[PDB]
Coordinates of all heavy atoms in Angstrom, one line a residue:
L1 N -36.8 51.1 26.2 CA -35.6 51.8 25.9 C -36.0 53.3 25.8 O -35.4 54.2 26.5 CB -35.0 51.4 24.6 CG -33.7 50.6 24.5 CD1 -32.8 50.4 25.7 CD2 -34.0 49.2 23.9
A2 N -37.0 53.6 25.0 CA -37.4 54.9 24.7 C -38.1 55.6 26.0 O -37.8 56.8 26.2 CB -38.4 55.0 23.5
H3 N -38.8 54.9 26.8 CA -39.3 55.4 28.0 C -38.2 55.7 28.9 O -38.2 56.8 29.5 CB -40.3 54.4 28.6 CG -41.0 54.9 29.8 ND1 -42.2 55.6 29.7 CD2 -40.8 54.8 31.1 CE1 -42.6 55.9 30.9 NE2 -41.8 55.4 31.8
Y4 N -37.2 54.8 29.1 CA -36.1 55.1 30.0 C -35.4 56.3 29.6 O -35.0 57.1 30.5 CB -35.1 53.9 30.1 CG -35.7 52.6 30.6 CD1 -35.1 51.4 30.2 CD2 -36.8 52.5 31.5 CE1 -35.6 50.1 30.6 CE2 -37.3 51.3 31.9 CZ -36.7 50.1 31.4 OH -37.2 48.8 31.8
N5 N -35.2 56.5 28.3 CA -34.5 57.7 27.8 C -35.4 58.9 27.5 O -35.0 59.8 26.8 CB -33.7 57.3 26.6 CG -32.5 56.4 27.0 OD1 -31.5 56.8 27.4 ND2 -32.7 55.1 26.8
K6 N -36.7 58.9 28.1 CA -37.6 60.0 27.9 C -37.8 60.5 26.4 O -37.8 61.7 26.1 CB -37.1 61.2 28.8 CG -36.8 60.9 30.2 CD -36.3 62.1 31.0 CE -35.3 61.7 32.1 NZ -34.5 62.9 32.5
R7 N -37.8 59.5 25.5 CA -38.1 59.7 24.1 C -39.6 59.3 23.9 O -40.1 58.4 24.5 CB -37.2 58.9 23.2 CG -35.8 58.7 23.6 CD -34.8 59.5 22.8 NE -34.5 60.8 23.5 CZ -33.4 61.6 23.3 NH1 -32.5 61.3 22.3 NH2 -33.3 62.7 23.9
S8 N -40.2 60.0 22.9 CA -41.6 59.6 22.5 C -41.5 58.6 21.4 O -42.6 58.0 21.1 CB -42.3 60.9 22.0 OG -42.1 62.0 23.0
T9 N -40.4 58.5 20.7 CA -40.3 57.8 19.4 C -39.5 56.5 19.5 O -38.3 56.5 19.9 CB -39.8 58.7 18.4 OG1 -40.3 60.0 18.5 CG2 -40.1 58.2 16.9
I10 N -40.1 55.4 19.1 CA -39.3 54.2 18.8 C -38.7 54.3 17.4 O -39.5 54.4 16.4 CB -40.2 52.9 18.9 CG1 -40.5 52.7 20.4 CG2 -39.4 51.7 18.4 CD1 -41.6 51.7 20.6
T11 N -37.4 54.3 17.3 CA -36.7 54.4 16.1 C -36.0 53.1 15.8 O -36.1 52.1 16.6 CB -35.6 55.5 16.1 OG1 -34.5 55.0 16.9 CG2 -36.1 56.8 16.8
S12 N -35.4 53.0 14.6 CA -34.6 51.8 14.3 C -33.5 51.5 15.3 O -33.2 50.4 15.6 CB -34.0 51.8 12.9 OG -33.3 53.0 12.7
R13 N -33.0 52.6 15.9 CA -32.0 52.5 17.0 C -32.5 51.8 18.3 O -31.7 51.0 18.9 CB -31.4 53.8 17.3 CG -30.1 53.7 18.1 CD -29.4 55.0 18.0 NE -28.3 55.0 18.9 CZ -28.3 55.3 20.2 NH1 -29.4 55.8 20.7 NH2 -27.2 55.2 20.9
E14 N -33.7 52.1 18.7 CA -34.4 51.3 19.7 C -34.6 49.8 19.3 O -34.4 48.9 20.0 CB -35.7 51.9 20.2 CG -35.5 53.1 21.1 CD -35.0 54.3 20.4 OE1 -35.5 54.6 19.3 OE2 -34.2 55.1 21.0
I15 N -34.9 49.6 18.0 CA -35.1 48.2 17.6 C -33.7 47.5 17.7 O -33.6 46.3 18.2 CB -35.6 48.0 16.2 CG1 -37.0 48.7 16.0 CG2 -35.8 46.5 15.9 CD1 -38.1 48.3 17.0
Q16 N -32.7 48.1 17.2 CA -31.4 47.5 17.2 C -30.8 47.2 18.6 O -30.4 46.1 18.8 CB -30.4 48.5 16.5 CG -29.0 48.0 16.4 CD -28.2 48.7 15.4 OE1 -27.5 49.7 15.7 NE2 -28.4 48.4 14.1
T17 N -30.9 48.2 19.5 CA -30.5 47.9 20.9 C -31.3 46.8 21.5 O -30.7 45.9 22.2 CB -30.6 49.2 21.8 OG1 -29.9 50.3 21.3 CG2 -30.1 48.8 23.2
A18 N -32.6 46.8 21.2 CA -33.5 45.7 21.8 C -33.0 44.3 21.3 O -33.0 43.4 22.0 CB -34.9 46.0 21.4
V19 N -32.7 44.3 20.0 CA -32.2 43.0 19.4 C -30.9 42.6 20.1 O -30.7 41.4 20.4 CB -32.0 43.2 17.9 CG1 -31.2 42.0 17.3 CG2 -33.3 43.2 17.2
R20 N -30.0 43.5 20.4 CA -28.7 43.1 21.1 C -29.0 42.6 22.5 O -28.3 41.7 23.0 CB -27.8 44.3 21.2 CG -27.3 44.8 19.9 CD -26.0 45.6 20.0 NE -25.2 45.4 18.7 CZ -25.0 46.3 17.8 NH1 -25.5 47.6 17.8 NH2 -24.2 46.0 16.7
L21 N -30.1 43.1 23.1 CA -30.4 42.7 24.5 C -31.1 41.3 24.4 O -30.8 40.5 25.2 CB -31.3 43.7 25.2 CG -30.6 45.0 25.6 CD1 -31.6 46.1 25.9 CD2 -29.6 44.7 26.7
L22 N -31.9 41.1 23.4 CA -32.8 39.9 23.4 C -32.2 38.6 22.7 O -32.4 37.5 23.2 CB -34.1 40.2 22.9 CG -35.0 41.0 23.9 CD1 -35.9 41.9 23.2 CD2 -35.7 40.1 24.8
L23 N -31.5 38.8 21.6 CA -30.9 37.7 20.9 C -29.5 37.2 21.4 O -28.7 38.1 21.8 CB -30.8 37.9 19.4 CG -32.1 38.5 18.7 CD1 -31.8 38.5 17.3 CD2 -33.3 37.8 19.1
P24 N -29.2 35.9 21.5 CA -27.9 35.4 21.8 C -26.9 35.8 20.7 O -27.3 36.1 19.6 CB -28.1 33.9 21.8 CG -29.5 33.6 21.7 CD -30.2 34.8 21.3
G25 N -25.6 35.9 21.1 CA -24.5 36.5 20.4 C -24.5 36.5 18.9 O -24.5 37.5 18.3
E26 N -24.4 35.3 18.3 CA -24.2 35.1 16.9 C -25.4 35.6 16.1 O -25.3 36.3 15.0 CB -23.8 33.7 16.5 CG -22.6 33.4 15.6 CD -21.3 34.1 16.2 OE1 -21.2 34.3 17.4 OE2 -20.4 34.3 15.3
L27 N -26.6 35.2 16.6 CA -27.9 35.5 16.1 C -28.1 37.0 16.1 O -28.6 37.6 15.1 CB -29.0 34.8 16.9 CG -30.2 33.9 16.4 CD1 -29.7 33.0 15.3 CD2 -30.8 33.1 17.5
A28 N -27.8 37.6 17.2 CA -27.8 39.1 17.3 C -27.0 39.8 16.3 O -27.3 40.9 15.8 CB -27.4 39.5 18.7
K29 N -25.8 39.2 15.9 CA -24.9 39.8 14.9 C -25.6 39.8 13.5 O -25.6 40.8 12.8 CB -23.5 39.1 14.9 CG -22.7 39.5 16.1 CD -21.3 38.7 16.0 CE -20.7 38.6 17.4 NZ -19.3 38.1 17.4
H30 N -26.1 38.6 13.1 CA -26.7 38.4 11.8 C -28.0 39.2 11.7 O -28.3 39.8 10.7 CB -27.0 37.0 11.6 CG -25.8 36.2 11.4 ND1 -25.0 35.7 12.4 CD2 -25.3 35.6 10.3 CE1 -24.0 35.0 12.0 NE2 -24.2 34.9 10.7
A31 N -28.7 39.3 12.8 CA -30.0 40.1 12.9 C -29.7 41.5 12.7 O -30.4 42.2 12.0 CB -30.8 39.7 14.1
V32 N -28.7 42.0 13.4 CA -28.3 43.5 13.3 C -27.9 43.8 11.9 O -28.1 44.9 11.4 CB -27.3 43.9 14.3 CG1 -26.6 45.2 14.0 CG2 -27.9 43.9 15.7
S33 N -27.2 42.8 11.3 CA -26.7 43.0 9.9 C -27.9 43.1 9.0 O -27.9 44.0 8.2 CB -25.8 41.8 9.6 OG -25.4 42.0 8.3
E34 N -28.8 42.1 9.1 CA -30.0 42.1 8.2 C -30.9 43.3 8.4 O -31.5 43.8 7.4 CB -30.8 40.8 8.4 CG -30.1 39.5 7.9 CD -29.9 39.3 6.4 OE1 -30.9 39.1 5.7 OE2 -28.8 39.3 6.0
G35 N -30.9 43.8 9.6 CA -31.7 45.0 9.9 C -31.1 46.2 9.3 O -31.8 47.0 8.6
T36 N -29.8 46.4 9.5 CA -29.1 47.5 9.0 C -29.1 47.5 7.5 O -29.4 48.5 6.9 CB -27.6 47.6 9.6 OG1 -27.6 47.6 11.0 CG2 -26.8 48.8 9.1
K37 N -28.9 46.3 6.9 CA -29.0 46.2 5.4 C -30.3 46.7 4.9 O -30.4 47.6 4.1 CB -28.7 44.7 5.0 CG -28.9 44.4 3.6 CD -28.9 42.9 3.2 CE -29.6 42.7 1.9 NZ -29.6 41.2 1.6
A38 N -31.4 46.1 5.5 CA -32.7 46.5 5.1 C -33.0 48.0 5.2 O -33.7 48.5 4.3 CB -33.8 45.7 5.9

């Protein structure tokens, strides 16, 4: 994500987007919730 967008830094926003790409729907929702909460 960060390479495609010419960024040097992996942020929580790259983790979040990555989670939306990799996890199936419901799991992705709860995972994004738990990540944002944390």
Side-chain angles (χ1 to χ4, degrees):
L1 258 342
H3 188 86
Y4 300 153
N5 293 279
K6 311 177 213 162
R7 322 257 92 163
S8 313
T9 319
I10 291 165
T11 75
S12 54
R13 197 158 170 276
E14 283 72 41
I15 303 303
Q16 185 162 95
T17 300
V19 167
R20 296 203 148 108
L21 290 164
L22 286 149
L23 316 186
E26 228 58 20
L27 231 43
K29 288 178 202 188
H30 291 77
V32 164
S33 179
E34 295 289 292
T36 301
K37 176 191 157 182

